Scaffold this active site. Structure first.
Site, PDB file in Angstrom:
ATOM      1  N   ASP A 154       0.866  -1.121   0.000  1.00 37.55           N
ATOM      2  CA  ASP A 154       0.000   0.000   0.000  1.00 37.55           C
ATOM      3  C   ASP A 154       0.915   1.184   0.000  1.00 37.55           C
ATOM      4  N   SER A 192       2.814   6.320   1.262  1.00 39.35           N
ATOM      5  CA  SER A 192       1.772   5.586   1.891  1.00 39.35           C
ATOM      6  C   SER A 192       0.652   6.207   1.134  1.00 39.35           C
ATOM      7  N   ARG A 193      -0.057   5.455   0.243  1.00 36.71           N
ATOM      8  CA  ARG A 193      -1.099   6.034  -0.601  1.00 36.71           C
ATOM      9  C   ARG A 193      -2.195   6.494   0.304  1.00 36.71           C
ATOM     10  N   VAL A 194      -2.470   5.611   1.288  1.00 37.13           N
ATOM     11  CA  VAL A 194      -3.237   5.787   2.485  1.00 37.13           C
ATOM     12  C   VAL A 194      -3.142   7.177   2.999  1.00 37.13           C
ATOM     13  N   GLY A 195      -1.970   7.439   3.598  1.00 39.72           N
ATOM     14  CA  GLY A 195      -1.654   8.690   4.148  1.00 39.72           C
ATOM     15  C   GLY A 195      -2.319   8.686   5.488  1.00 39.72           C
TER      16      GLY A 195
END
Lengths: 167, 487, 466, 127, 66, 467, 106
Positions: free
Chosen positions: B324, B349-352
Site C-alpha cells: 500500500d 503511503s497512498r493511504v496517508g
C-alpha cells in the site's frame, strides 16, 4: 471402451498398464485364472533366448519376429488373448518388461489379496490379512527365524540407534 | 516398525520420488528415514514428488519414507517472544527449545472483509521521517525498500526499538510483537543481528524466524509462512504484531528455483507466476483486524531490497502493487552518509491519513506538504542561481529538515521528541540553523526538554497530540532554547 | 563396493553401483583407472545407478567398468603438512614434489557451521596496510572480494600480504587456484618461490597451494574450493587459525557450477546460472568464518563477470561480501603501489555506527578531501592552485602526501615501488593520515610519503631532504 | 500413445483384437479429449488434413495423422464431448463454400451466415 | 537394551564405571587434554591472565585537569 | 459419476473417474472436501480420467479420495440479490451475512451474444473528466481497459471515477474485486456500505460485488471472472440494464490463466502465458458486449505487468478494447494525477461527428502539440536551449499548462491528496483547453492548471497562483 | 558376435549413429563403420553408442556393423609435415601422396 476391473492388486499400471488390461480382461471372462497360470508358465517359457533374443537383434524385423517367437512357440499354449497380448507386448517391445508385468500381475488371485506391512526382516511375505483382526503376531510366532540385525535390525524393530539418535 | 512405510523411489536433486505411503494427507510433511522431513507436495500416482526439507547429499534411495502424517504447521506460542528459531520454530538459539510448543498450520488464510477492520491507527516507528511521511498504522503490509543493507535493515531495528516503548509500555495495540522473518540472511548476518536485538532486548517481545544464508530452499521459502502462521496468532489474539520479512527476493529465488529444479518452469523473470499468489497469500494474512480478532494486527513489513532500484522488476512490481506503498530509500544518500537516506519521493503511503499520529500531524502533516514544495524546489529548481528567499529558505530550511529525517541509526524516538524537533523546524525556528548545527541542536534540545520540558512532553504524550498551549510552551522552548543552543 | 559404467555421456557417468548407492557426495575411485578417475555420487538415479561426476578425465571407459566407492567423499590431506605444497584438487602434489602428505585426510563434504558456534561477532584481521584496513576493514572469517586490474602485482601485493599478515598475524594461507591459469600459477610458482613466500628448502611457507585449474573438469574446478575449505577448517578450528584463504578466482567456481547445471538437468537459472547459485554459494559462505577458534578469512580473487555486478551472481556475491576491493590502475598509474582506488575499498558495514567514527571520519575527511581535491583535479585542471586558496593548497598537498603515504614500498616489486617494503600498525596508520590532516609536517616533502609504510619514516625522510 | 492403449480400456480389447475388431477408421472414438484437441483413436485410414466430423456434430480436422490416433483440432467446444466420442470420417479435407452471393454477405469463416440475414446460398465450394 | 531403560543401563553402568573412575568420568585421555589446553589458554587471551583462582585488586589515580 | 483423486499436483487435480466422465467443465463436488471443493473438469485426460481443477487449495487430501460430480458446471445464484453483496464465484456471502438467495441459477459460462443481437455501432458515453472524455470519449456500454500500473492511485483513480460517474450513473453496476488486496476491498466495502449504495438495508444495492482475491487459489480467482460475467449479463439483458462493469484486475485474471497453463500440462507460452489467451479472451470479451437488451459499460482495470504492454498479453489486450486508458507511469510519477498517456489512451471514438468537431479538433491540435512536444523533449532535455525556436517555447510551456490542466486532484481522497479540483462538464472542458489554445493564459502560472477542475477556476487559480 | 566390438547401427539419423552394442567401449574410441568410415564413439549409452560419423548417411544405412578398432585417435606426428597440407588424420590432402609423419601422437 471397457470399464474398470482390477483384481486385488490391482496395481499402479505402467508396465502393468497392460497388467491392468488383463486386470480387467482376464478378470472379465474370468479366465482370470487361466491366464493367471499362463503367465506363470510363460515366465520361464519366456526366459531363454531364442526367437526372443531375436528382438534384441534389432535387425530381425519385428514383423516376423512376432511370427516366430510367438507364431510356432508363443501360442504353444499361450493364446486366448494371451498370444495376442504377447503379440502386443511384442509389438510394443514390452517383452523385456514382461516379467515385471507378471510380478505386478501375480500379486492377483491369491496374492491379489496379498500381505504388506513393512516389517522387519523378510518382512511381509504377501499372503493375506484381514485388517479388522490381527494376523501379525501369529506369523511371528511361527518362526523364530529371519535375521534382524543383518536383516531388519533393532534400529527399526526397536531403535538400537535411537538412543544414539537423541545424542 | 516399518508397519506402513514407503521407499524412496528415486532421489536426485533433492526430489524424492517416493514410492508408497500412498494415501498421504496432502501437504503432509512426511518424514524420511534420514530424520529429514519433506513434504509431499506432489502426488503423482505412482510416486510422490517430494519436496525435501534438508538436503539430498544425505540421501540414499529406496529409503524409508514414513508418513509423518502431519500437514505442515509451525509451532505457535509466545515464548518465542524472547527467542530465535529456525523456520520450523525449532531453536537455533541453542538455549534448548522454546516454550512455544503449540503448533498451528501454516496453511491458513487471510481473513475476510468483515473480520477485518480498516486502519485509523498510527503505528509508531520512532523514525520521524517514517511515521510522518509514510505514516504508519498497524496491520499494514508495506514495502521497505532499499538497496543492500543500506541501513534497510537498520530501519527495522529502530522501529522495533520503538515498539520497545510499547511492550515496555503497556500497549494494548501498540504492543507490537515483532516477528522477524530473516530470509537468506547469512548466519553471520543474523547472528550478528540477533546479537543486537537481544541487546535491544526487544527480543523479549520478538520472534525471530530464521532462514539465514543456509537453509534448504523450501526452508527459506517456508520461513515466512511459518511467521505467517504465528503472527496471525497475535493478531487474532488481539495482540498486535509486526512481521518483518527480509526479503522475499531471496525467498522467491529459492522458490522459483525450487520450481525449476522441480523442472517446473517459471514465467517472467524466470520466476513462476503464482509467486504472486505467494506473496499475496502470505501477505494478505497481514492485516488489521476487527475486534473478533481482538482487533489485533499483524503489521507486515515486507522488505524487498530493490535490485538496482528496480522494481519494474516483475516481482517487485508485484510486491509494490500489493503493498500500500513503499519506502524507497535513496541509497546514494545513504552513501552520501545520509542516514536515513530516503527516497521519499519514492516513499509513499497512498493511504496517508488513516496511518498518522495527530501530534505529529499537527506539525508534520502540514510540513509534509510544505516539504513537498521545499523538496520540490530542491529538485525543481536546480541551478547555481537564487530564486527568492522563500524558496531559498525552503531549501535551507528544508535541508535542515532533511537532517531531521535522518537519525543516526538505531536511535528511534517517542512521538513527542520527534514532534518536538519538528516543531522547531516547521514553526520556523530552525530554518535559521544549519545542518551541522541541527543535529547538535537536537541533541541539546532533547537534553533541554529532557531536563525541563518534560512537562510539555508529558502533555504531548498525554494527548498523544499537540495543543496550541503546549505549543506556546514549545514556542518558548524553541526560541529560548535556540538562543541557548547557539550562545 | 563396485560400479559399472552403465552410461557415459561424457563425465556424467552413469554408474550403477549395485551394492547399494552410497550417499551423494561419496567419492568413488573408479576401478580400471590408470588415470585414477574419481567419480562423486551426485544422484541416486535408482536402478542402483547414480549419476556421478568425473572430476577427472576419461577414456578407456570400457563399459560396465568397475568403480570403487571410497565410502566417503574425496579424502584429501588435512593437517599442516600441506603448507608450502601444491596439490591438485584431489590433493596430490602438482607441486610435483612427491607426497603432499599430511596426517589426516578428509572427506571433503563438510558444510555450514551453526550460527551459535561462531563467535557470532567478528573482528578485523589486521592487514597493516594502511589503506587496506582503513578503507576496507578486513574481517577475520570474512569474505573480501578482490576486484582488480590485471597482473598489476595483484599477486605482488598479495605476496606481500602473506608476508605481513600470514607472517605477522598468525595468518596462514591457502591458495586455491580455482580454474586458474596453470601457467600463471606456474609463473607464480616461481614467483612465490622467488618471493620466498613459498619456500622449498623448508616448505614452511604459509601457503598450501591447491590448484584446480582450467585443466580440471568443472566438477573438479568447482570442487577444489570445498577441498581448500576442508583444510582451512582444519587449520581454523584445529590449528585455531586465522586462515587466509586465497580463493582465486571465484568466478571460476561459478562458472564451473553453472556449466554443469544444465546438463545436470538442473535449470541453471538466470544468465545460465545454476539455480542453486546462492545455495552453492551460501553453504560455502557459511564455512567462511571466525568460529570460535580461528577464522577462515577469504581473500577472494574476484573476476568481475561481465564487469556486471547486478549480475545476479555478483548480486549474490554482495551478500557474501563484507568488504569489497577494487584494485585500481588509476592509482597504480600514479606509481602508487598500492594501486588501490579507495572508493572501491569499502565494507558495506561502513558507518560510524559500525566502522566507527574517527576512522570513518578521518576517512570521511579523506575520501571527501581527496575527492574534493579531485574536484579540484578538475578545477585546478582549469584554474590552477593559484586560483585556489591554501586550504586547497593544503588539501592538495596533504592529499598528495596522503597519496604518497598510501604508498608503502615493496620487498617483492622493488621493481614497481623501488625497494623493500614495511609494515604499519593501524594506530599509527590512522594517526599517520590524521597527522597529515593536522598538516603538521607543513608540506615538508610529500614524496617522502611515497613508498613508506609507516608515516614517520616519511616525516623523517622529509627532513633528510629539508 | 505409449501409455494409452498400453493401458487397458483402449488396450483392453485390442488384446483380443476384438473391439469393432478395432475399426475407428472411418470412425474414431475420441481417444482423449480436452480442449478442442481430440485425440481420436482410430480414423486410421485417413486422408491427410481431413476435416472430420464429430459425434458432437462438429468438425475438427485430422491434420496429424499419427499412427494411432488423430490429432484433431476440433474447431470448438469441449463441454459438448466427453471422451470416446465418435468421430466419423468424412474422407474429406476442407474446401469451403465460395460463390458470388457471398458478395453482399457476412459469413462466418465457415462461409455460413452470422449475418443474421438468414443464410447465404452456397453455390460453389472450393478448395 | 529395549526394556528401553536397560539401554540407559547399557550406557549408565558405563557412566557408573566412568564416573567411578577418576576425574569422575575419564578415559577422554590426553588428546582431549591438548584440546582443552588450547581453549582453556585461548579463553585467557580474550579474558586476561592472573587471579582466576583468587581475587584481583585494582588502583585509582588521575593525570591532570587538562 | 465419481472419480477419485488420483494425482494432486497442486490444485491441478487429477481425478480418475472410474466410470462416466460428464463433459469437460462439469463442476464436481469432492466427496470429502467440505471445503467446498469444486473441481471443474478441465480435460478429459483419457481413460476416464479428467484433469479437473481445484478452485480451492488441497492440504490434507488423501490420495484416493472420492469425488462426486456436481453434475454440471457451476450453478451459481443469480439475480438482483447479488447486488449489494459480496459473492465469490459461488456467490457466497463474503458479505458474510449469509446467502445470496436468488431464484435463478447459473452456469457461470455464458457465451458471445449474436453479432446481430448486439447493437452494431454504439454512441458515446462521455466520461466527465475533462482530459478523459476529451481525448478518450467512451461509448455507452463500452469496454474500456485501463492500463495502468495498479495501485498508483491507479486504483484510486478508478474509484474516483466510480465516485464521479458510477454515482452519476443510475442503472446498475457490477464490481469485481479480483485478485486485489482484500484489505482494500475491506475498506472499500465499508466505504460502499458507508455509501449506503451498498445499502445496508437492501440486499441489493445497485451494485453487486464479486471477489477473486489474490490470496486465493487460482481457480477461484480465475473463475470469478465468468461468474461476474454471468451476473452482469443477467442484469444487462435480463434487467435490460445499463450495467457498469468494474474489473480489478483482469491482469490478475490473465495471470491466473497463464499460471495454470503450464500446470495444465499445456505449454505455458511466451513469457510463460496461457497460449490460449486469445481464445479465452476472444470468447470472453465477446461474452461481453452491450447488446440491445442492455448495455454494459465495462471499465476494466488493467494492471500491466512492469507496465509492459509490449509484453504480449497487453499486446493482445488491445483487440478487446475499443477504449484503452493508458496511464503514463511518468506522469503519475510527476505526481500528476491525471497521469495518463493519452496519446496512448485511445478511442477512435473521438469524432468531429460524434464528438463534434470542436472538441475533436481541439483535441487534434492538442494531441498534436503534445505529440510533437514530447519528441523534442528528450533532445532538448540534454540539449538544453536556445540557439533554437521559441515559438516552440511557447508550445512547450503551453503544453505544460495543458498538461497541468489535465490534472485534477483526487477530489475525494483528501487523505491521499488533501486536494480537490473538480470535474469539468464537457463544454467547459473543450473550452478550457481551447482557451489555452487561445493562449491568453500565457503569462500565467503552470500549476494553476495543475490539479483542478473548470478552467475558469483554474484561471482564477492562475491569477491567484500569480499570488 | 558383438555388441561389444561390433555393433549394429541402432539408428542413424543422419550422421549420428546410435549404435547398438559395442559395450566394452572405451570412452572416446574411434570406431569404423561397415562402410569403412569411421566415427567416434563419444556417448556410451547402454543402449546405443552416440557415434559421431566421419562420413554420411547417404553412404550407408542402419544395423550396420560398426566395429571397434579399439582406438582413440592419435594422428601422425613427427616434424616433417613441413610443407604439408593435410587432412586432420594427420594424413594429407595436399595430394603429394602421404605425409612425412609416421609416429602418431595423441
Amino acid at each position: 471402451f471397457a470399464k474398470l476391473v482390477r483384481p486385488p492388486v490391482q496395481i499402479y499400471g505402467i508396465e502393468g498398464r497392460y497388467a491392468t488390461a488383463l486386470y480387467s480382461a482376464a478378470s472379465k471372462q474370468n479366465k482370470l485364472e487361466q491366464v493367471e497360470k499362463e503367465l506363470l508358465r510363460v515366465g520361464q517359457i519366456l526366459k531363454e533366448p531364442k526367437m526372443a533374443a531375436s528382438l534384441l537383434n534389432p535387425y530381425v524385423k519385428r514383423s516376423v519376429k512376432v511370427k516366430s517367437l510367438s507364431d510356432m512357440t508363443a501360442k504353444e499354449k499361450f493364446s486366448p488373448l494371451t498370444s495376442n497380448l504377447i503379440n502386443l507386448l511384442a509389438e510394443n517391445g514390452r517383452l523385456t518388461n514382461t516379467p515385471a508385468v507378471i510380478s505386478a500381475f501375480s500379486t492377483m488371485m491369491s496374492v491379489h489379496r496379498g500381505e504388506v506391512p513393512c516389517t522387519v526382516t523378510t518382512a511381509s511375505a504377501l499372503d493375506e490379512t484381514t485388517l479388522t483382526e490381527l494376523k501379525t503376531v501369529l506369523k511371528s510366532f511361527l518362526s523364530k527365524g529371519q535375521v534382524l540385525k543383518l536383516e531388519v535390525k533393532i534400529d527399526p524393530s526397536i531403535m538400537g540407534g535411537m538412543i544414539v539418535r537423541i545424542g | 516398525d516399518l508397519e506402513e512405510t514407503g521407499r524412496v523411489l528415486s532421489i536426485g536433486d533433492g526430489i524424492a520420488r517416493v514410492h508408497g505411503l500412498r494415501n498421504v494427507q496432502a501437504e503432509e510433511m512426511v518424514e524420511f528415514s534420514s530424520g529429514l522431513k519433506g513434504m509431499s507436495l506432489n502426488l503423482e500416482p505412482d510416486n510422490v514428488g517430494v519436496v525435501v526439507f534438508g538436503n539430498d547429499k544425505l540421501i540414499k534411495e529406496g529409503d524409508i519414507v514414513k508418513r509423518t502424517g502431519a500437514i505442515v504447521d509451525v509451532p505457535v506460542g509466545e515464548e518465542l517472544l524472547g527467542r530465535v528459531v529456525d523456520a520450523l520454530g525449532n531453536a537455533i538459539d541453542g538455549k534448548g527449545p522454546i516454550g512455544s510448543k503449540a503448533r498451528r498450520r501454516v496453511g491458513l488464510k487471510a481473513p475476510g472483509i468483515i473480520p477485518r477492520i480498516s486502519v485509523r491507527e498510527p503505528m509508531q516507528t520512532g523514525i520521524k521521517a517514517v511515521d510522518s511521511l509514510v505514516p504508519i498504522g498497524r496491520g499494514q503490509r508495506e514495502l521497505i525498500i532499499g538497496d543492500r543493507q543500506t541501513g534497510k535493515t537498520s530501519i527495522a531495528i529502530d522501529t522495533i526499538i520503538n515498539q520497545k516503548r510499547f511492550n515496555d509500555g503497556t500497549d494494548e495495540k501498540k504492543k507490537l510483537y515483532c516477528i522477524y522473518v530473516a530470509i537468506g540472511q547469512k548466519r553471520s548476518t543474523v547472528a550478528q543481528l540477533v546479537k543486537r536485538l537481544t541487546d535491544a532486548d526487544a527480543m523479549k517481545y520478538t520472534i525471530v524466524v530464521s532462514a539465514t544464508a543456509s537453509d534448504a530452499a523450501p526452508l527459506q521459502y517456508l520461513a515466512p509462512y511459518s511467521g505467517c502462521s504465528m503472527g496471525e496468532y497475535f493478531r487474532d489474539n488481539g495482540k498486535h504484531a509486526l512481521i518483518i520479512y527480509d526479503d522475499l527476493s531471496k525467498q522467491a529465488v529459492a522458490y522459483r528455483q525450487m520450481s525449476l529444479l522441480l523442472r517446473r518452469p517459471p514465467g517472467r523473470e524466470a520466476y513462476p507466476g503464482d509467486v504472486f499468489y505467494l506473496h499475496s497469500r502470505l501477505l494478505e494474512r497481514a492485516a488489521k483486524m476487527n475486534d473478533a480478532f481482538g482487533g489485533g494486527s499483524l503489521t507486515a513489513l515486507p522488505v524487498i531490497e530493490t535490485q538496482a532500484g528496480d522494481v519494474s522488476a516483475y516481482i517487485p512490481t508485484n510486491v509494490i502493487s500489493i503493498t500500500d506503498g513503499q519506502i524507497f530509500l535513496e541509497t546514494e544518500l545513504f552513501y552520501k552518509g545520509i542516514r536515513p537516506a530516503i527516497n521519499v519521493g519514492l516513499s509513499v503511503s497512498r493511504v496517508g491519513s488513516a496511518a498518522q499520529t495527530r501530534a505529529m500531524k499537527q506539525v508534520a502533516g502540514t510540513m509534509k506538504l510544505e516539504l513537498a514544495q521545499y523538496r520540490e524546489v530542491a529538485a525543481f529548481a536546480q541551478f547555481g542561481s537564487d530564486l527568492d528567499a522563500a524558496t531559498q529558505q525552503l531549501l535551507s530550511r528544508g535541508v535542515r529538515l532533511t537532517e531531521l529525517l535522518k537519525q543516526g541509526q538505531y536511535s528511534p524516538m517517542a512521538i513527542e521528541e520527534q514532534v518536538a524537533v519538528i516543531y522547531a523546524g516547521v514553526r520556523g525556528y530552525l530554518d535559521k540553523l544549519e545542518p551541522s548545527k541541527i543535529t547538535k541542536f537536537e541533541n541539546a534540545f532533547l537534553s533541554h526538554v529532557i531536563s525541563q520540558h518534560q512537562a510539555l512532553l508529558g502533555k504531548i504524550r498525554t494527548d498523544g497530540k499537540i495543543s496550541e498551549e503546549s505549543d506556546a510552551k514549545l514556542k518558548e522552548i524553541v526560541t529560548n532554547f535556540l538562543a541557548g543552543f547557539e550562545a | 563396493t563396485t560400479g559399472r559404467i552403465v552410461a557415459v555421456i561424457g563425465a556424467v557417468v552413469d554408474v550403477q553401483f549395485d551394492e547399494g548407492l552410497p550417499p551423494i557426495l561419496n567419492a568413488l575411485e573408479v576401478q580400471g583407472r590408470e588415470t585414477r578417475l574419481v567419480l562423486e555420487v551426485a544422484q541416486h538415479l535408482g536402478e542402483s545407478t547414480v549419476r556421478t561426476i568425473a572430476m577427472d578425465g576419461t577414456e578407456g571407459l570400457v563399459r560396465g567398468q568397475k568403480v570403487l566407492d571410497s565410502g566417503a567423499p574425496i579424502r584429501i590431506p588435512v593437517g599442516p603438512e600441506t603448507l608450502g605444497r601444491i596439490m591438485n584438487v584431489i590433493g596430490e602434489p602438482i607441486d610435483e614434489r612427491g607426497p603432499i602428505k599430511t596426517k589426516q585426510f578428509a572427506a571433503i563434504h563438510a558444510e555450514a557451521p551453526e550460527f551459535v558456534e561462531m563467535s557470532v561477532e567478528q573482528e578485523i584481521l589486521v592487514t597493516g596496510i594502511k589503506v587496506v584496513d582503513l578503507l576496507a576493514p578486513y574481517a577475520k572469517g570474512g569474505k573480501i572480494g578482490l576486484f582488480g586490474g590485471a597482473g598489476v602485482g595483484k599477486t605482488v601485493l598479495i605476496m606481500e600480504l602473506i608476508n605481513n599478515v600470514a607472517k605477522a598475524h598468525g595468518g596462514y594461507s591457502v591458495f586455491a587456484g580455482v580454474g586458474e591459469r596453470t601457467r600463471e600459477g606456474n609463473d607464480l610458482y616461481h614467483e612465490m618461490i622467488e618471493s620466498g613466500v613459498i619456500n622449498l628448502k623448508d616448505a614452511t611457507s604459509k601457503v598450501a597451494l591447491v590448484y584446480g585449474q582450467m585443466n580440471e573438469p568443472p566438477g573438479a574446478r568447482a570442487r577444489v574450493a570445498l577441498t581448500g575449505l576442508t583444510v582451512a577448517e582444519y587449520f581454523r578450528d584445529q590449528e585455531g587459525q586465522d586462515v587466509l584463504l586465497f580463493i582465486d578466482n571465484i568466478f571460476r567456481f561459478t562458472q564451473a557450477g553453472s556449466e554443469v547445471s544444465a546438463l545436470l538437468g538442473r535449470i541453471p537459472s538466470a544468465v545460465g546460472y545454476q539455480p542453486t547459485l546462492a545455495t552453492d554459494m551460501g553453504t560455502m559462505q557459511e564455512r567462511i568464518t571466525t568460529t570460535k577458534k580461528g577464522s577462515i578469512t577469504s581473500v577472494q580473487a574476484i573476476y568481475v563477470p561481465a564487469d556486471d555486478l547486478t549480475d545476479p551472481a555478483p548480486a549474490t556475491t554482495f551478500a557474501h561480501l563484507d568488504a569489497t576491493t577494487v584494485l585500481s590502475r588509476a592509482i597504480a598509474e600514479l606509481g602508487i603501489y598500492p594501486a588501490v582506488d579507495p572508493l572501491d575499498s569499502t565494507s558495506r558495514i561502513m558507518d560510524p555506527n559500525i566502522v566507527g567514527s574517527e576512522h570513518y571520519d578521518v576517512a570521511r575527511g579523506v575520501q571527501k578531501i581527496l575527492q574534493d581535491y579531485k574536484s579540484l583535479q578538475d578545477i585546478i585542471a582549469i584554474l590552477g592552485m593559484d586560483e585556489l586558496s591554501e586550504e586547497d593548497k593544503l588539501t592538495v598537498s596533504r592529499a598528495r602526501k596522503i597519496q604518497r603515504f598510501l604508498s608503502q614500498p615493496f620487498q617483492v616489486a622493488e621493481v614497481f615501488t623501488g625497494h623493500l617494503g614495511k609494515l604499519v600498525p593501524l594506530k599509527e596508520t590512522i594517526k599517520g593520515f590524521q597527522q597529515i590532516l593536522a598538516g603538521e609536517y607543513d608540506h615538508l616533502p610529500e614524496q617522502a610519503f611515497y613508498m613508506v609504510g609507516p608515516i614517520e619514516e616519511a616525516v623523517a625522510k622529509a627532513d633528510k631532504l629539508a | 500413445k505409449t501409455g494409452t492403449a498400453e493401458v487397458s480400456s483402449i488396450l483392453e480389447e485390442r488384446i483380443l483384437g476384438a473391439d469393432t475388431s478395432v475399426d475407428l477408421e472411418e470412425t474414431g472414438r475420441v481417444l482423449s479429449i480436452g480442449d478442442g484437441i481430440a485425440r481420436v483413436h482410430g480414423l486410421r485410414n485417413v486422408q491427410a488434413e481431413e476435416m472430420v466430423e464429430f459425434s458432437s456434430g462438429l468438425k475438427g480436422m485430422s491434420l496429424n495423422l499419427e499412427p494411432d490416433n488423430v490429432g484433431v483440432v476440433v474447431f470448438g467446444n469441449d463441454k459438448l464431448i466427453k471422451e470416446g466420442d465418435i468421430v466419423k470420417r468424412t474422407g474429406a479435407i476442407v474446401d469451403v463454400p465460395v460463390g458470388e452471393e457471398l458478395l453482399g454477405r457476412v459469413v462466418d469463416a465457415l462461409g455460413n451466415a452470422i449475418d443474421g440475414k438468414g443464410p447465404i446460398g452456397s453455390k460453389a465450394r472450393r478448395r | 537394551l529395549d526394556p528401553v531403560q536397560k539401554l540407559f543401563v547399557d550406557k549408565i553402568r558405563e557412566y557408573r564405571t566412568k564416573r567411578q573412575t577418576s576425574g569422575g568420568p575419564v578415559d577422554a585421555g590426553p588428546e582431549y587434554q591438548q584440546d582443552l589446553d588450547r581453549e582453556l589458554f585461548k579463553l585467557k587471551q580474550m579474558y586476561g591472565k592472573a587471579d582466576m583462582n583468587t581475587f584481583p585488586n585494582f588502583t585509582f589515580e588521575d593525570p591532570k585537569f587538562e
